[PDB]
């Protein structure tokens, strides 16, 4: 039922009880949950909702969470039954819990972990304690095709049965349709095929409370369970993965986005694990190492996604990997997994425990529902504002700066209607002046300035006119690291211009001032992840609530505005605010480029030359 104002009239189905201020939760029958942070029971409710519900919005005071079948499965596999969840909900709900939500929870929890998938002898078996379920499922044609066929094409016979390797993800999706999701549980201590490894945790390793909480939630009753953990960049997420690998101590395979990711993973493993370097190898095309005796093998998706013929040695290493069965597999940048080629990698590799870590989980192509069974339920997601309060990461000062359009530029922008409009507003003379003023001001403040520009041409022109280092498609790796070290060590040069490769193609040194000029055009997760990775925790200004500075230049009256509001929405979900700065104080006195419009019309000439 809907009110004339459009709001949902849930009052009738919600019996309100007098314990209003004491209880902090609202449970609408839509499945959504609302929590008040100012309530004294905030911490307990916070942990309960995190355990049971997937967070949606966490602004300063009131937070919204959501209930999903995957969230309920995660809660059940943690070890919580229906009665306890219902009791705790009713103890925290301001109003009575609607019977519809109760029934939904009952239906979800009554069948969770019913079906078990076992990887033994390089063979995948489906087994359970309810043979009627399995027998009834045999009628499903997709299950019939997924089931392993004999040499004669016949079907292979708590008795389990082998399933075709290629048809795992098909079974993964199908089981959801069968309302009987599989269980990704590993024999952490009962393992006998794969022995342990001489790898432990160095005493220098420190588990921050949220990291330890996430790890222990993953280790449900001491058994590792597949899932995804979301942590901000530089919050020890790599350290968290290293710690998990050390805990498992079984054969470990790690996949990174690029070669720099592999190098960082190897360095982190050396920095905190006791594994000897003889057992660490990088399955890359540049640094080749023998796979034999390699306890922890680090590679990239492309090195496993090569449909084309590889090098002969690469073929041998792939054969070794396929033969070997992995107790643990680690995937970084999970948001890139839903791509078809990378999804095929999961079928290619046979591993028991797969764990995914990333900074964001909102793929703009909404290919995330499948990921809930590609890997598993979202294990954890730390509150960004809470981590800011604890000082684990910098307390960022976000800002969106609007730049007026030159009349000639705006007339041209309106004249064009196709995708070619990108160049004009990305080359706004006023935007150039604003960026120059910001760079001058922060250099006078002695700040680490990193300027992003997704457009290749705009990046080149901006960096060259400002005479600052620029990195783009070519990105000669040796010279790339040379520029990075110049920024890190030389105080004379502290202004680095980086193209789209700054997302995941290399390592970003910790900075304090991040100026984003051009973006993908709606990649709400990509540039938010770029902001998270660029700005890290810095000593000295921890007490202040604004120790990291982020500026997003947007051209007024352009379509770019529509992108920015579309994009930073994700950061709004984390409580981050963006104050509009139409005009910058101090630009008048300081001399900047394009003071004359005669220069600006020459710039327009240059831009229009490239159509």
């Amino acid at each position: 039922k809907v009110d004339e104002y459009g709001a949902k009239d849930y009052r009738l189905q919600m019996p309100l009880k007098d314990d209003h201020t004491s209880r902090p939760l609202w449970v609408a029958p839509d499945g959504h949950i609302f929590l008040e942070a100012f309530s004294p029971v905030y911490k307990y409710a916070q942990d309960f909702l995190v355990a049971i519900a997937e967070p949606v919005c966490r602004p300063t005071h009131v937070h919204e969470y959501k209930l999903t079948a995957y969230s309920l499965y995660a809660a059940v596999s943690v070890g919580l039954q229906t009665s306890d969840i219902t009791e705790y909900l009713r103890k925290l709900s301001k109003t009575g819990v609607p019977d519809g939500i109760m029934q939904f929870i009952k239906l979800c929890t009554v069948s969770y972990g019913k079906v078990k998938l076992v990887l033994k002898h390089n063979r995948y078996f489906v087994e359970s304690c309810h043979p009627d379920v399995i027998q009834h499922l045999l009628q499903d044609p997709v299950i019939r095709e997924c089931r392993l066929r004999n040499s004669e094409g016949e079907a292979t016979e708590t008795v389990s049965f082998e399933v075709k390797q290629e048809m795992i993800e098909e079974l993964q999706k199908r089981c959801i349709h069968l309302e009987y999701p599989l269980l990704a549980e590993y024999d952490f201590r009962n393992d006998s095929v794969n022995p342990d490894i001489n790898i432990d945790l160095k005493p220098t390793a420190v588990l921050r409370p949220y990291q330890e909480k996430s790890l222990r939630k993953m280790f449900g009753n001491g058994r590792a369970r597949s899932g995804v953990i979301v942590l901000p960049c530089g919050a020890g997420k790599s350290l968290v993965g290293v710690t998990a690998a050390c805990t498992v101590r079984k054969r470990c395979l790690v996949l990174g986005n690029s070669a720099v990711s592999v190098e960082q993973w190897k360095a982190q493993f050396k920095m905190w694990s006791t594994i000897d370097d003889s057992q660490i190898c990088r399955f890359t095309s540049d640094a080749k190492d023998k796979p034999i005796g390699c306890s922890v093998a680090i590679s990239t998706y492309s090195m496993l996604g090569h449909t084309t013929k590889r090098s002969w040695e690469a073929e041998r290493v792939m054969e070794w990997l396929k033969t070997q069965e992995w107790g643990l597999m680690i995937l970084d940048e999970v948001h890139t997994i839903p791509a078809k080629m990378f999804r095929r990698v999961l079928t290619i590799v046979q591993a028991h425990c797969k764990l995914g870590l990333t900074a964001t989980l909102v793929r703009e192509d909404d290919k995330i529902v499948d990921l809930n069974f590609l890997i598993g339920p979202k294990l954890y997601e730390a509150n960004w504002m809470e981590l800011q309060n604890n000082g684990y990461i910098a307390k960022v000062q976000c800002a969106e700066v609007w730049c007026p359009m030159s009349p000639e530029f705006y007339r041209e922008y309106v004249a064009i209607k196709t995708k070619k409009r990108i160049l004009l507003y990305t080359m706004n003379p006023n935007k150039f002046r604003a960026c120059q003023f910001l760079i001058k001001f922060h250099e006078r403040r002695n700040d680490k300035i990193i300027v992003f520009a997704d457009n290749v041409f705009a990046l080149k022109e901006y960096a060259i006119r400002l005479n600052k280092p620029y990195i783009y498609g070519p990105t000669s790796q040796g010279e790339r690291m040379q520029i990075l070290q110049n920024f890190k060590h030389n105080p004379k040069i502290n202004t680095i211009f980086i193209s789209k490769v700054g997302d995941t193609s290399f390592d970003l040194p910790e900075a304090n001032v991040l100026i984003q000029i051009s973006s993908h055009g709606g990649s709400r997760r990509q540039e938010a992840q770029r902001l998270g990775r660029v700005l890290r925790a810095k000593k000295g200004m921890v007490a202040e609530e604004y120790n990291a500075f982020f500026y997003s230049l947007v051209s007024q009256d352009t379509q770019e505005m529509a992108y920015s509001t579309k994009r930073q929405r994700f950061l709004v979900d984390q409580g981050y605010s963006f104050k509009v700065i139409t005009k910058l104080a101090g630009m008048e006195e300081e001399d900047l480029a394009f003071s004359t419009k005669e220069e600006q019309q020459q710039l327009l000439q240059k831009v229009l030359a490239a159509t």
Partner: peptide
């Protein structure tokens, strides 16, 4: 070895 098992259920108690 703190990862053997841990729950904040007892933290959630009426007061």
């Amino acid at each position: 070895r703190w990862e053997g098992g841990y729950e904040r259920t007892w933290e959630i108690l009426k007061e």
